[PDB]
Structures are given as structure tokens and as C-alpha cells.
Design an enzyme around this catalytic site. Sequence first.
Site, PDB file in Angstrom:
ATOM      1  N   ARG A 146      20.640 -31.220 -24.919  1.00 18.83           N
ATOM      2  CA  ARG A 146      19.863 -30.626 -23.851  1.00 18.83           C
ATOM      3  C   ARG A 146      20.810 -29.873 -22.933  1.00 18.83           C
ATOM      4  NH1 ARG A 146      16.452 -33.560 -18.942  1.00 18.83           N
ATOM      5  NH2 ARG A 146      15.222 -31.707 -18.395  1.00 18.83           N
ATOM      6  N   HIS A 147      20.306 -28.798 -22.338  1.00 18.42           N
ATOM      7  CA  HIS A 147      21.003 -28.072 -21.283  1.00 18.42           C
ATOM      8  C   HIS A 147      21.423 -29.034 -20.179  1.00 18.42           C
ATOM      9  CE1 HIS A 147      17.643 -28.671 -18.598  1.00 18.42           C
ATOM     10  NE2 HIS A 147      16.854 -28.379 -19.620  1.00 18.42           N
TER      11      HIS A 147
ATOM     12  N   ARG B 285      19.900 -28.642 -13.927  1.00 23.96           N
ATOM     13  CA  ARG B 285      19.273 -27.383 -13.544  1.00 23.96           C
ATOM     14  C   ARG B 285      18.382 -27.602 -12.327  1.00 23.96           C
ATOM     15  NH1 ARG B 285      14.037 -28.399 -14.025  1.00 23.96           N
ATOM     16  NH2 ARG B 285      13.255 -29.518 -15.874  1.00 23.96           N
ATOM     17  N   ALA B 286      18.110 -26.516 -11.599  1.00 24.27           N
ATOM     18  CA  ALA B 286      17.096 -26.570 -10.560  1.00 24.27           C
ATOM     19  C   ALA B 286      15.732 -26.810 -11.192  1.00 24.27           C
ATOM     20  CB  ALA B 286      17.075 -25.274  -9.742  1.00 24.27           C
ATOM     21  N   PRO B 287      14.755 -27.279 -10.409  1.00 23.99           N
ATOM     22  CA  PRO B 287      13.369 -27.340 -10.897  1.00 23.99           C
ATOM     23  C   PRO B 287      12.886 -26.004 -11.438  1.00 23.99           C
ATOM     24  CG  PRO B 287      13.558 -28.540  -8.840  1.00 23.99           C
ATOM     25  CD  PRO B 287      14.915 -27.917  -9.091  1.00 23.99           C
ATOM     26  N   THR B 288      11.994 -26.074 -12.434  1.00 21.41           N
ATOM     27  CA  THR B 288      11.459 -24.872 -13.068  1.00 21.41           C
ATOM     28  C   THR B 288      10.350 -24.199 -12.264  1.00 21.41           C
ATOM     29  OG1 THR B 288       9.866 -26.176 -14.330  1.00 21.41           O
ATOM     30  CG2 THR B 288      12.027 -25.729 -15.375  1.00 21.41           C
ATOM     31  N   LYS B 289       9.717 -24.913 -11.330  1.00 18.52           N
ATOM     32  CA  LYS B 289       8.593 -24.370 -10.577  1.00 18.52           C
ATOM     33  C   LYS B 289       8.521 -25.034  -9.208  1.00 18.52           C
ATOM     34  CE  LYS B 289       5.702 -25.036 -13.582  1.00 18.52           C
ATOM     35  NZ  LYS B 289       5.107 -25.506 -14.864  1.00 18.52           N
TER      36      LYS B 289
ATOM     37  N   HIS C   3      16.638 -28.127 -25.437  1.00 18.83           N
ATOM     38  CA  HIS C   3      15.800 -28.688 -24.382  1.00 18.83           C
ATOM     39  C   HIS C   3      15.480 -30.160 -24.635  1.00 18.83           C
ATOM     40  CE1 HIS C   3      15.036 -24.526 -22.990  1.00 18.83           C
ATOM     41  NE2 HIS C   3      15.187 -24.280 -24.279  1.00 18.83           N
ATOM     42  N   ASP C   4      14.858 -30.823 -23.658  1.00 17.79           N
ATOM     43  CA  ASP C   4      14.566 -32.223 -23.935  1.00 17.79           C
ATOM     44  C   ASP C   4      13.406 -32.364 -24.916  1.00 17.79           C
ATOM     45  OD1 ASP C   4      12.546 -31.543 -22.101  1.00 17.79           O
ATOM     46  OD2 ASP C   4      13.462 -32.692 -20.485  1.00 17.79           O
TER      47      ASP C   4
HETATM   48 NI    NI Z   1      13.806 -36.300 -20.512  1.00 20.06          NI
END
Ligand code: NI
Length: 405
Positions: free
Chosen positions: A11-12, A15-19, A298-299
Site C-alpha cells: 500500500r502507498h 496520505r492526507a484524507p481523500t475527501k 492500495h489497501d
Molecule cells: Ni486498511
Amino acid sequence: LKLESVVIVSRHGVRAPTKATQLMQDVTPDAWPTWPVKLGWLTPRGGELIAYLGHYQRQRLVADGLLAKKGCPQSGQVAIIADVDERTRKTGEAFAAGLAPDCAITVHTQADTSSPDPLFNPLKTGVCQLDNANVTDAILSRAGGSIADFTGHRQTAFRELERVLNFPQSNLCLKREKQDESCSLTQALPSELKVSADNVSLTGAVSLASMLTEIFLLQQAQGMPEPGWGRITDSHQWNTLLSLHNAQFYLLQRTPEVARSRATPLLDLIKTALTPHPPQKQAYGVTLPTSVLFIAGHDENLANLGGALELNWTLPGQPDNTPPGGELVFERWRRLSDNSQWIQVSLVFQTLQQMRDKTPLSLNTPPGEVKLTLAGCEERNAQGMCSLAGFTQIVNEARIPACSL
Ligand code: NI
């Protein structure tokens, strides 16, 4: 045993929140801490945590005799593939910077970076479709028969989230009171399973809670002074919170009726990297097989692979079962007694405290690691690994050919 090859599905990083939605504002009277990067981007601290993992992997793979102790890996000995998202590309570079600093290992992506890559989700470009009825029934059954059954068995964790949010003093709750009420998340925001040909999701409190508890975890890992406005104070609370995130991934991403399709291109890529064969330039201009392949995803991808290959785990000290920088590690090992080939699978991760303290990783301070077993493997060795042939049979059974690239 002698290590021959390794594929790391990562997984990356942090990160900041996506939204940033209105509902996120409406469920707490407090203000969400702001982030130093655009929505959904990797933070610099996120990349630094990934480089720690890359440095550790170099030390480990050197000790295993697969990589040289000094100098840069030569000509494709290490290959890196990343999804087109900023966060996955930057994770690729961070891993390369930790594994082989100043070697300029290329982070390959698909040609068009402004479009989705079907490798990380073939549903997203319509390569194939889910079976609506089978998916609906499979997911509902794993939830206990209904989404009401699912949330009922989890009130303790939803109540934990409400406390951390100070939900009773929120706009949503204050309105509910003027309106006959029920100031509970699950009932204010009823949850429905939405199944389409290309996607599955939950609405309402289940998906809101999965996202909010992950944000809490990201704040902690980012080093923010008081995640959850300081109201998350011991590991029991952290575990209870992220159990809602893990439960949503158990339903939406581990379910085989979803996972097998979504993971098919990655399964093909993994098997190509791990199977002995004359080296040949394949996907992304990467020559395979080679010594090390790092895939920045990604997760959902970790969960999809876990669900398709019947790999089950929980991460000691890491509330998120599919955490930032978490690595699903496939290794091909040659047994010297008879020169047979074996596949080992592991989940390598930073504990939440190792992310909180920005702990440099090494052989003497390793990340956590969970040994996995392919539950369906018929031919295992004493150390739990599946024979090359067994793993190949399992992959051919789990993959959905209509979803292949
Ligand atoms: Ni997760």
C-alpha cells in the site's frame, strides 16, 4: 533454503484524507486538523516511512544473498511498478530511495497517467463485471445475514467512534433531537449495500466510520499532536476504532465474489514475476522474472489478494489490517536438498508506534511481520510454504479469466 525472488505488493504510504465532506463536518462539533498536502497525496513523512521500509528490505535481501551489499542493483534486478495516483507513484520513489539511494531506479506506470490503470482494479475500466446477485448474497452472508445484523454486533465500536467525535454535541445529533431523535450513528445514517456492475459500497454509518477511523490512524502516523482531538488514549481504543475500518474491508474487499475479479491482473503479474522463465520484457517495459519487484498499490489490493488466496491475518500492534506502507510479500525459495521451488507469503508492516515515533528500521529494529499460509494449498513444506506447483494451481483457480489484461 535459498531466496530466489521476491514480489512486494505495498500500500502507498501515509496520505492526507481523500475527501472533506459536509457529513464529516456534521458528525462532530470539533474542527478536523488540516493536512500539509492536497487531498489524497502522500505526505513527506509518509514517504520517509516508506524509505525506512526500503532500507530494511535492502538489509534483509542483502543478508539473504539476493542483492549486493554495495553498489546499485544492475539492469532490472529490481523493478518498480506503481498505480498512476500521486500517492502510489511517490511511494514507489520513496521505496527506491530507501532500498537503493541515488541509484535512480525507475518507477514505471502505465503510459497514460491521467487515466485509471486496470492492473489495480479491472472493474474500474470495465475489463470485466461483477455478478450482481452472487455478490449481493455473498456480502450479506459474510455480514451475518444483513447489514442490520452487522452493525448490531458492533455497537460498542460505533459508540467508541461517537465518543471520539463528541457525536452527541454535533450538528447531526442536535438536529436529530429537535426531530424525535435517535442520536446514534448507525440509525441516523442507515447503511445500505449498493452493488453495481463495476463497484460495491456501503452507504451511511458503515462507510463513514471506515473512513473516519482510518483518518484517525493517519493522523497518528503523521505525527499530529492530538489525533481524534486527544480522545484516543490507549491501544484498546485504537483497536476498537479501526475494527470498523477492517470490517468494511472484510465485506467489500476480502469477499471472494469481489476479491477474485478485482485481484486477477495482480495475480497474473505476481505469478509472472515468481515463475522461473527466460527473462522477457512484459508489462510496463519491465523485464520479468527478476530478483525484486515492488508494486505500489492500495489497501483494496492487499485485501483483494488476501481474499482471493485465502490468506488471513491481523497485525500485532497495528490496528489497520491493511496499513499505509503495509506489504504483502511473495517469495520464491529453492530448497537445496532436492532443488524444489516453494512460495512464502508474509505481511510486513510498521506498527502504529513505529509510525508514530518515525522509527528507523533495520535488522535489529525490524518492522512487524506475520507469516501467512495459503489455506487452500495441498502441498506445503515444513516451514508452511506452498510448492510452486501448488501456488500455481491455487492462482489458476482463484483468478477470473474475463478480468485478465
Ligand atoms: Ni486498511
